[PDB]
């Protein structure tokens, strides 16, 4: 890394089972200039403005019933110790349970989150989903989480 700026671009572990596990140990994945990955969370090394982003890809085949799919980026402060949502999005693919004989056609739902936030040294960033059974990390570039000091 030639830059002096704290960075991260972590990606879902394709080998993880029933969980969204962030990894920097892959090609085209970053973790530099103080940014850490501790308990599946990005640790802020210094105060400043950060561009924070994440993408998840959801996949399903047909409809079971309700299917509420969430994706959130939250801030966990060192001082207040509380968890606050910075960026949040919801997707509902299933309007009704697929009728008894209707074809279960595979659907795909991507979600992108991104914004500039003032963060403190030691703050923890979490990029989470509620339904790992719908998560699609089968191929590269589909689910990622990153930060960059600006």
């Amino acid at each position, epitope marked *: 890394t030639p830059s002096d700026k704290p960075v991260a671009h972590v990606v879902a572990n394709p080998q993880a*089972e*029933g*969980q969204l596990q962030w990894l920097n140990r892959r090609a085209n994945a970053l973790l530099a200039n103080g940014v850490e990955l501790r308990d599946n969370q990005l640790v802020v090394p210094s105060e400043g403005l950060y561009l924070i982003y994440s993408q998840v890809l959801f*996949k*399903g*085949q*047909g409809c*079971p019933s309700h*299917v509420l799919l969430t994706h959130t980026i939250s801030r966990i402060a060192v001082s207040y110790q509380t968890k606050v949502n910075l960026l949040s999005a919801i997707k509902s693919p299933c309007q009704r349970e*697929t009728p*008894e*004989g209707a074809e*279960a056609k*595979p659907w795909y739902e991507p979600i992108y989150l991104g914004g500039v936030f003032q963060l403190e040294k030691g703050d923890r960033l979490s990029a989470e989903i509620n*339904r*790992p*059974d*719908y*998560l*699609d990390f089968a191929e590269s570039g589909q689910v990622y989480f990153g930060i960059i000091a600006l």
Partner: nanobody
Amino acid sequence: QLQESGGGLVQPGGSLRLSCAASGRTFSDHSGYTYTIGWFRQAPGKEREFVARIYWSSGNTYYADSVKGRFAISRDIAKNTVDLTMNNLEPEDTAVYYCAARDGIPTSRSVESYNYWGQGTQVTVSS
């Protein structure tokens, strides 16, 4: 709760379809987010190994490296069954094949992650 069907003898290079049906408590009736159904195999005097996994809700799958591309795991909602289509069979595919389920989402593909098992079905790949 689980019962495997299909199986038996097949010529190498051949195909075979295994089925796993849930009796009593259907896969549609879960307390959790979904039922997770796994296919396993145990070759004589060898440890039980993971083959494939499917979530009953999404139909999202995971395959063992040696079966990815030749085996297909699918969920038939109406008939409350989990099918395993096995193509490009080879003599070392001979094993007893087991169906396993969990009312929830396992964080491992380990045999220990599943509590409920079918009795198993013998698959023999020979001339």
